[PDB]
Scaffold this active site. Sequence first.
Site, mmCIF file in Angstrom:
data_model
loop_
_atom_site.group_PDB
_atom_site.id
_atom_site.type_symbol
_atom_site.label_atom_id
_atom_site.label_comp_id
_atom_site.label_asym_id
_atom_site.label_seq_id
_atom_site.Cartn_x
_atom_site.Cartn_y
_atom_site.Cartn_z
ATOM 1 C CG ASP C 56 -1.761 24.846 -39.908
ATOM 2 O OD1 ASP C 56 -2.713 24.287 -39.302
ATOM 3 O OD2 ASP C 56 -0.506 24.850 -39.931
ATOM 4 C CB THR C 89 -0.963 24.511 -35.398
ATOM 5 O OG1 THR C 89 -1.914 25.028 -36.293
ATOM 6 C CG2 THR C 89 -0.110 23.418 -35.696
ATOM 7 C CB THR C 90 -5.258 27.867 -34.532
ATOM 8 O OG1 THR C 90 -4.688 27.737 -35.954
ATOM 9 C CG2 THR C 90 -5.741 29.253 -34.130
HETATM 10 N N1 LIG Z 1 -18.570 23.149 -38.871
HETATM 11 C C1 LIG Z 1 -17.956 23.072 -37.432
HETATM 12 N N2 LIG Z 1 -18.756 23.333 -36.396
HETATM 13 C C2 LIG Z 1 -18.449 23.180 -35.195
HETATM 14 N N3 LIG Z 1 -16.888 23.129 -34.869
HETATM 15 C C3 LIG Z 1 -16.189 23.008 -35.687
HETATM 16 C C4 LIG Z 1 -16.680 23.332 -37.242
HETATM 17 N N4 LIG Z 1 -15.447 23.290 -37.938
HETATM 18 C C5 LIG Z 1 -14.553 23.191 -37.363
HETATM 19 N N5 LIG Z 1 -14.911 23.147 -35.790
HETATM 20 C C6 LIG Z 1 -13.930 23.015 -34.789
HETATM 21 O O1 LIG Z 1 -12.658 24.002 -34.848
HETATM 22 C C7 LIG Z 1 -11.598 23.174 -34.717
HETATM 23 C C8 LIG Z 1 -10.564 23.522 -35.745
HETATM 24 O O2 LIG Z 1 -9.498 22.508 -35.767
HETATM 25 P P1 LIG Z 1 -8.476 22.733 -36.920
HETATM 26 O O3 LIG Z 1 -8.794 23.761 -37.826
HETATM 27 O O4 LIG Z 1 -8.083 21.262 -37.380
HETATM 28 O O5 LIG Z 1 -7.106 23.151 -36.168
HETATM 29 P P2 LIG Z 1 -7.108 24.522 -35.284
HETATM 30 O O6 LIG Z 1 -8.067 24.264 -34.228
HETATM 31 O O7 LIG Z 1 -5.569 24.769 -34.919
HETATM 32 O O8 LIG Z 1 -7.822 25.722 -36.152
HETATM 33 C C9 LIG Z 1 -11.951 21.779 -34.524
HETATM 34 O O9 LIG Z 1 -11.343 20.999 -33.356
HETATM 35 C C10 LIG Z 1 -13.403 21.544 -34.411
HETATM 36 O O10 LIG Z 1 -13.880 21.155 -33.039
HETATM 37 MG MG LIG Z 2 -6.043 22.160 -37.705
#
Ligand SMILES: Nc1ncnc2c1ncn2[C@@H]1O[C@H](COP(=O)(O)OP(=O)(O)O)[C@@H](O)[C@H]1O
Ligand SMILES: [Mg+2]
Lengths: 191, 546, 520, 48
Positions: C56, C89-90
């Site tokens: 995170d 957050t990223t």
């Molecule tokens: N399997 C997946 N396929 C497509 N998009 C994804 C997948 N997993 C995550 N994402 C995208 O990556 C983003 C990651 O969000 P999250 O990990 O909750 O916080 P951060 O964006 O700060 O890393 C999400 O908004 C989502 O749209």
């Molecule tokens: Mg996240």
Amino acid sequence: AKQHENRLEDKDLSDLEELEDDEDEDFLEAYKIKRLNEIRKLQERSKFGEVFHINKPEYNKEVTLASQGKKDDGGVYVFVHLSLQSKLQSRILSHLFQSAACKFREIKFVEIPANRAIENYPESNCPTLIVYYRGEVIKNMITLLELGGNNSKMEDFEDFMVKVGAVAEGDNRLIMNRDDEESREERKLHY
Amino acid sequence: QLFNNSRSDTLFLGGEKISGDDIRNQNVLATMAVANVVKSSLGPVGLDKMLVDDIGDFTVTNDGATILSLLDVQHPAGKILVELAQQQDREIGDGTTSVVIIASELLKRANELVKNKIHPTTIITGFRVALREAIRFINEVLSTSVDTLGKETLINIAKTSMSSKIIGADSDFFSNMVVDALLAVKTQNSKGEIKYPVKAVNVLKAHGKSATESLLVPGYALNCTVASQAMPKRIAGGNVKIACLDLNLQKARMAMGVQINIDDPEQLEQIRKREAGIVLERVKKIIDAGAQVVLTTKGIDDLCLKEFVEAKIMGVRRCKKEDLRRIARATGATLVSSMSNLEGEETFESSYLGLCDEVVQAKFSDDECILIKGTSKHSSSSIILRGANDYSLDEMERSLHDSLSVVKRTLESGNVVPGGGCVEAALNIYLDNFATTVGSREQLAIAEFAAALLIIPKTLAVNAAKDSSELVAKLRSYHAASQMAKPEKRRSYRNYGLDLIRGKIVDEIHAGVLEPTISKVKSLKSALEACVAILRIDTMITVDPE
Amino acid sequence: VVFMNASQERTTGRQAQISNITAAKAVADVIRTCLGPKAMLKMLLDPMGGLVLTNDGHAILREIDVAHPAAKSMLELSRTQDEEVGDGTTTVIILAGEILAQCAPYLIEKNIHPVIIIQALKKALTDALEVIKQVSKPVDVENDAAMKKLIQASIGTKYVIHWSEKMCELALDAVKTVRKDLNFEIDIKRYVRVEKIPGGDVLDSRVLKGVLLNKDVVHPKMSRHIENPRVVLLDCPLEYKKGESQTNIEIEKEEDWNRILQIEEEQVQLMCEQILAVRPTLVITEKGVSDLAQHYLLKGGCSVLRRVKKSDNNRIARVTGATIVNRVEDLKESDVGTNCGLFKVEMIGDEYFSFLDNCGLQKACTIMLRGGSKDILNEIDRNLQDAMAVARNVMLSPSLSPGGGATEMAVSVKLAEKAKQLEGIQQWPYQAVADAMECIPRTLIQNAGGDPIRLLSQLRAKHAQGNFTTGIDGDKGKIVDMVSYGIWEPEVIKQQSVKTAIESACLLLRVDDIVSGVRK
Amino acid sequence: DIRLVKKVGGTIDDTEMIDGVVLTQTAIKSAGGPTRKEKAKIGLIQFQ
Ligand SMILES: Nc1ncnc2c1ncn2[C@@H]1O[C@H](COP(=O)(O)OP(=O)(O)O)[C@@H](O)[C@H]1O
Ligand SMILES: [Mg+2]
Ligand SMILES: Nc1ncnc2c1ncn2[C@@H]1O[C@H](COP(=O)(O)OP(=O)(O)O)[C@@H](O)[C@H]1O
Ligand SMILES: [Mg+2]
């Protein structure tokens, strides 16, 4: 390294009971018996507790013999006050003696008029604070301009007692270390 | 400058000795050295700076008030400009960046007059006759505050104070905020004189959405946490009573003198009970009064919290002295230092309690704030600023705090004048014709005084990274015709300044930028009094510390 | 004759901005690979010695002390994003870096003023919130089956996607317990408790509505299994309270000293008799308990537990409905808690654990997480904080938007067209905002291992047809619509990202001089 | 009898002879009851 020492060193007999459920009994009770013995020594050493309004014949005994104490070098600190009622600093220092006497019962607090102390001693020179220990004069203090003068407080007087070796630095009775209960209450909530 | 002088040649001083025009040059470079950091921060085109404390901590600041206060300078000639920046923040609250630049250039431009064998007494006399002539011209060129059917003034005044800040783009949203805030916290004193206490509104360091979505509170917002978590957070219904106490409510000992000494141990428990009971008798009568919300300066012990949780009372500890006076002033209550009256009995009357419509505790990004809204007797206001972090909000806090002082002055004194270096360029044309009338040596002093006033509109163009002489020459042309206007309105070629975002000369009245005239008055006198202090020094005597 | 104890020298002009923008790019480079489902993990060595394994954004930035002051404005954005929402957050850091990286060759090349760029970002931010409102849509909030896939969206990046079927039920029951009726969802993370128990298996877990205490009973005669417990909260110690007045009793007769210790026993006797006035079965106190008071409570069966924290007493109050009362005289039957059950003390060799369960709408619970190490317990615990953080916004507002680069691409396709209309000087930095939203889709593609030049080229033509729900898959890298898979996030995460990214760029773009040596 | 009270603030032009005795110290403002007095009887307390 200090994290292990803060469990025992930074907690009195009342605060050591906090770690009864967390820490081991043998680790905790071994130190509580040690701290309990130290508390008993201070009670036996509590030979004082109010200002000894003395006179000269007696000085040759109260001020000096006491300073020898048991003579086990059981030394005793004796704070003398050459009082002069006409001066404003003298009445302030007299209040600090009675306030400190109620707290530090092991230290002797002595008071005497300055006119009766020394023959023709200058009136200007007093309020004079002398500290005896084992018959030797540890500190011949001059008027309280060093300790703030007219604005002298109880916190400044207690800090002076630590410098001459009369009270330990980490003593729980000192106002610098004796944090208020409301202060510690806010620390636990914000932790 | 070139080399160090001889150290006490047949003078026998323990410190250093220097004399002549060398120290006079060092004062010019000293005032210019501290003024260079203030140059780039002037005008809307100026950029901010950051000061590092060598501990990781840093703070972003645009105004030179706290920048020069933080910069620890050891040269005493620079300390006067440091205190001048702090002085101007107290009285006027705006223009700290301008007095440092104006005072430095008056000394810099007067440095040429020193080596002409013009005495400083004649130079300051030529500056002072130019000053009082400039103040009367400022008193002639000022305009009324109506200007139209509607107000159409206070929204434009905020834009001048809000310019050159991080939230200058959002000044259109915050312009309505500051005018609605200060009109709510007015008061009455001296039999009809209206006052506007600055800093009475609460500026909260919140984090979240954005500076654009900052909600204006219609009431005061107290920044403190709740004592216990089992208490009710939201209290609805009209006529919510507010109790403002300051006495010591936690269990405390008897006074210094009293020493409880006991011989019959039977009453040893009873004296313990009444010491615990005497503090609860005070809480008993507050419940009889029915105060829903109670505020205390000192702490609140757990012996008192059980009664508030049971009777559903909102007890809040760790209030400050300056806040509770504004709570009692807004909610209509009175400050209670102790519960007593002229009679010997002890009681509490319902008249001491205030009134408000709603009280709600809100939390936003680890910031618990009690929102008190709907004060019946007198209104109040608070501004919840929102941004990136606390250090960015400190610039916004100073930006809002300076905005209240500027809007304070335009209501206390309705006279205003346009910005953009208008009056700074107008005084030059007025003083050039006056400089020829006086005749003798003061012509150069009045003339160079006028040339130093042009540095304000010049710095707007230099920091803009544009051509400056074309804008100054065009601003000079219009102001040159103002003195020769030939009255009969058709008195045009006045009240114009620079427009930096487009690079043209337009009317500042329609553009919507103004500034009160009293800020120009105090800034000129305080800048000249600082110039008098530096010019009159001849020789320095620096004594080393023992 | 230095004239300044704090950096008499100065670094002014454009070189200060190169140090600022390059530092803003460097903080994004160390977390560029921390996005998408195939994101990697990081390790941090704090000086205290407590390691942590984090992906995170907020946990990475807060444990890294940075000497560059201009960079620290970027470090605090995840702190702002964490306390506001707790998810996404990223994206705020890399988006703020791309805005600053894209806006770099305009003062160097075009020599456009910063204040013109400040106006350009606000109009882009105004249009960014407009098109996000158009792309978003509402859904039903009460459908428990719909809430599972939304919680699964943020979980897909973390390690616990393999147990996503268990984690969704673990978090959905917890957030609904603390939820109540009254901003229509005033529940707070502070009420939710999460106790980390090393050992066990993560598959075996359950949402118990209670307060898990980490201590044993004080006396061995007490029964550890109660069918119908009665909770009573107290703040007074059962020990004898010492008076703060300091009193000296002088004993001159002989029966006074014996009567004092008898009054001590009589006071504890009278004090314990008032506890039994309402005949409780479970007592809780936040202070010590004397051994004298333990014997008198055996006849009533009042189980006592001591040295309980102040926050845990409030959590015990909301579950069982008991009122915290300091003095022992004001105990009434209404003060005694009710509707409690299943009080049992499970024996574990590490520490003693006591459970609670219910049968004033505020409630609380305790999620007992089982694992293999204390560090991964913090990982799963932080995933629980992220699991409920994504669930609050869908409950607060019914608004909802897609994700996975699709919502960011919709801003760029609309914003580029708006720049095409813009016509002037501000249109040059207005185009930088449209190009700044391309890092997120790009980042996702790069991490997945695909070729971003051709995948994004056809994505431009795909969104030109007039659709918005088309994203990029993280595993294989298709241009398939996210309606089939079910990648959906709240609208508040993307709103806070573009707002914090624009507001952070306005702070850092208006810096031209750097100084130090103040020592406040 | 001619006391020169130094107050930091304002300008030198605002200096003028005060008719009555000007006090340097400020009020306590612990209670803050009264604001402005008229036809007041002044007393000098030396005790505590
Ligand atoms: N399997 C997946 N396929 C497509 N998009 C994804 C997948 N997993 C995550 N994402 C995208 O990556 C983003 C990651 O969000 P999250 O990990 O909750 O916080 P951060 O964006 O700060 O890393 C999400 O908004 C989502 O749209
Ligand atoms: Mg996240
Ligand atoms: N929008 C504007 N257009 C032209 N000049 C302006 C504008 N805003 C401010 N100024 C000029 O900037 C000068 C100082 O601005 P000020 O608000 O005091 O800056 P700071 O807040 O940094 O002290 C004023 O004399 C005014 O003429
Ligand atoms: Mg200003």
